[PDB]
Write a protein that binds this ligand. Structure first.
Ligand SMILES: O=C(O)[C@H](Cc1ccccc1)Oc1ccc(CCc2ccccc2)cc1
Lengths: 270, 270
């Protein structure tokens, strides 16, 4: 019954809101949008980052650039720290999807382990436009130029994601849409190692049917949007693969450090 | 609302099952012969230790050890592998603790630094009974007596732990109890160096509430179990202290032995 689906959509959207601080709606306002009442700190130059890191509420290290701890590394690493905060936010959202917590615990871990990078880049698009990405809960903004002028390995790191974001955002989906989409992603069924695929695809079939109605009733003039969104799952996958790549290329720049034992432990890969 | 607390417990118990391969429940089932689906091989001497490499999965030496890392040394270098292994896990259990990742990076490291061994000795009791302790995921069982008859120094490492366990297991706590206690231990606040404290103590306060409800519901007839358990935290501190000084003696009577990096970094003095 359509009523059942409309119901599931509201539940998912409700949890999403509770589970994620910065929403796309909220992020869109700060961005190009006006809603000027608390403008962000633009970081466009080396001095911009320096002369504005002792004022930002970012957790990692104080601004110090003088032949000690490079900016390129402090930025990449700072990106991991946040990515890990996000994972707890996603794990909590997964537990809100009907049927999820009832599945074999091992499969739950398997589903979260492989679905997390896909969710992260999906939501990273909500905070990006063609000129840059919002930073620190939206308190600041880091231009796309500065990022492209970083170290050799780190210069081509966030460019493929800027490209994905631009095309992805062309779809003009809103938080209520993203909520269901993100759930479809988690309830895949082709993840390696699953022990009992049946219930997983059963739940996903239900989420897919909800997504179809959510898009048809929320974007009436946007024909076949359902199909267009599912096709994006191809780009995301490439984005995730291509990412583990450069990542390994970095795993050969900085490693053996007797000061990062318990810290590097908390930041494996995902 | 006692509803949210119950929900927090459920959460924690769930991540607990997901981070530890050998739960107390599996352990007791193995320790009580009632279930011979897979009984352990017993180690109470050199012969049985020799026959040990056989069925059990050991990559160490099997034959003589007098001229190739004596037995005592053989036992403890493996023990060392288990600790780093436990830390990596506890480290993983931590990230799932609501709020732990949102804290100051420096403090996170401080929290894991002082809590890790206290947790290991808490969980290590799930594998001991008056007579000994399970080894290699439960496939083996090493005699308390054998362990105590080890060379002058090494033979003092485990005894104090057995004493803690005998009394601690008296409490008859189950896996869903240990999960919350384990969390209350990490989020201390009275730990040295903590840049902050209020954020840290807000989370523990919440954990303590959940543990308090769990014990009541789960152990209705056990008077003052909450308080009794917290008093146990005192016994852990001492144990960590006798352990450290012992560790220091080995560092001097064996210039050949080397304490793993991830363990040397955690350890300190005074
Ligand atoms: O302090 C630790 O992190 C571990 C904690 C522990 C102890 C017992 C069971 C599980 C975990 O206990 C020890 C004690 C001694 C050692 C010595 C390691 C060693 C032995 C022989 C040769 C070289 C190094 C390592 C770990």
């Amino acid at each position: 019954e359509s009523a059942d689906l409309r119901a599931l959509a509201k539940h998912l959207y409700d949890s999403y809101i509770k589970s994620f601080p910065l929403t796309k709606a909220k992020a869109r306002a700060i961005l190009t949008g006006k809603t000027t009442d608390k403008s962000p700190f633009v970081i466009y130059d080396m001095n911009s980052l320096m002369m504005g890191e002792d004022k930002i509420k970012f957790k990692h290290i104080t601004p110090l650039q003088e032949q000690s701890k490079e900016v390129a590394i402090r930025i990449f690493q700072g990106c991991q720290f946040r990515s890990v905060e996000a994972v707890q936010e996603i794990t909590e959202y997964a537990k809100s999807i009907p049927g999820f917590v009832n599945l074999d615990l091992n499969d739950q871990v398997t589903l979260l382990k492989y679905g997390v990078h896909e969710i992260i880049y999906t939501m990273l698009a909500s905070l990006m436009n063609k000129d840059g990405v919002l930073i620190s809960e939206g308190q600041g903004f880091m231009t796309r130029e500065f990022l492209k002028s970083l170290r050799k390995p780190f210069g081509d790191f966030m460019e493929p994601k800027f490209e994905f974001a631009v095309k992805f955002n062309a779809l003009e989906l809103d938080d209520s849409d993203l909520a269901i989409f993100i759930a479809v992603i988690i309830l895949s069924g082709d993840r390696p190692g699953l022990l009992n695929v049946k219930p997983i695809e059963d739940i996903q079939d239900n989420l897919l049917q909800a997504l179809e109605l959510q898009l048809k009733l929320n974007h009436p003039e946007s024909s076949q949007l359902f199909a267009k969104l599912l096709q994006k799952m191809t780009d995301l996958r490439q984005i995730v693969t291509e990412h583990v790549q450069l990542l390994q290329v970095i795993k050969k720049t900085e490693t053996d450090m007797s000061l990062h034992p318990l810290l590097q432990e908390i930041y494996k890969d995902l």
